[PDB]
Symmetry: C3
């Protein structure tokens, strides 16, 4: 039983040129790349992505920080929504555990390199927001017998 | 005072071709390779290895997963039995801490890449099962003065 | 606001030839190298460095272990004093969290690879002990807009 999560490399991940390192951390667990697209995020899509923060005082600055190149991604694996959140670490890098992306790469929450869906409902919504169904690619990893019990 | 632990790369570690990465994690701490051998695990040896689980419903499938190439290893260091367990992380990769082998490489307990002895008694038993005493090598690490206090 | 911490690679870090790896861990978070100097630590300077341990029974052996080549460093970043301590891990490598320097490289407290200031007051004192003000270099990281919120 696998699931799919939406992971997005933020403009800081692009500009610091750590895209490959980020992808490698998820590939290392045998997570499958189901979708991937470079785009430039717009305020319109970011308002919907961050709909849960509508009307809040930090939202305008958050949208500004995120208006730039982003790598949209879908990864598949067992419990991958919760596991990817664990791998990213706490929102504030200073509170994130050693060995997580945010602790290993970042200093402040406003430049914390990566987004990941936080629940099954948010993963389904975010994947549908950033990807059309034809962009989601179905294939089986050749090492599946050695990844899944 | 140093001790020795039995560590075994399971068929998934061989087939995913991460043997060198695993070894490097233990070398990085100045643990000494006291024994190393590639073999193919068979049911009769695995039944001894997993003797405590004789008769449990999960055992036949466990033996099937483990019937394959394995890298038998003995590493030596301070508190190495407990430390190697900590480095591997929880049996269930989803519960394992970031930075541990199972958290960094794996998804499920049935394919969790590596075995390590859980106690002094188990290390003696497992080293005797998988190695002949001839295969344990005695030598001193040249960097000892900078590894040990 | 950013702050500055004193970090020192101990003789074991020099002799095990892991200097670059240590530096890379701090650079990876966008911490800025403000000062760096290779020297050979001597008892007189180490007595001042370890002044808080004056008169204690273990101090003589600590000074002996530390008499050797060291890399003096100053790193700058948000909350860098506390964060560098978190990255180093517990004094005892066996208690340190996976993903920390001491857990990843070391076995025992007496050979734990690296020193870092434990407080704002000790950072100011240690930077002044090991560096003259003219050795502290001020420049801005080109990726600042993507590191700091
Ligand atoms: N009170 C606040 N003041 C300023 N910025 C905030 C505040 N709360 C949240 N943010 C910003 O909102 C961003 C997203 O916040 P959220 O609570 O969704 O965290 P997250 O789930 O870790 O992030 P993401 O969805 O990007 O993975 C954080 O990176 C932070 O920059
Ligand atoms: N009981 C001990 N056995 C061995 N070494 C010790 C012991 N106590 C202290 N040391 C050594 O003394 C150094 C200074 O001790 P302290 O309590 O200041 O730890 P620390 O703050 O982690 O170390 P450092 O200042 O080197 O970063 C320790 O890093 C360790 O190298
Ligand atoms: Mg969020
Ligand atoms: Mg100290």
């Amino acid at each position: 039983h696998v699931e799919q999560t939406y992971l997005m490399i933020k403009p800081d991940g692009i500009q610091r040129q750590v895209v490959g390192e980020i992808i490698s951390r998820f590939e290392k667990r045998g997570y499958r790349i189901a979708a991937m697209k470079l785009t430039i995020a717009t305020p319109a899509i970011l308002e919907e992505h961050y709909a849960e923060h509508k009307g809040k005082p930090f939202l305008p600055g958050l949208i500004e920080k995120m208006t730039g190149p982003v790598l949209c991604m879908v990864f598949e694996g067992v419990d991958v929504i919760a596991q990817a959140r664990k791998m990213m670490g706490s929102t504030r890098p200073g509170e994130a555990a050693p060995g997580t992306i945010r602790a290993d790469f970042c200093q402040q929450a406003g430049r914390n390199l990566i987004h990941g869906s936080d629940s099954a409902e948010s993963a389904k919504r975010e994947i549908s927001l950033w990807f059309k169904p034809e962009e989601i690619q179905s294939y089986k990893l050749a090492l599946s017998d050695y990844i899944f019990e």
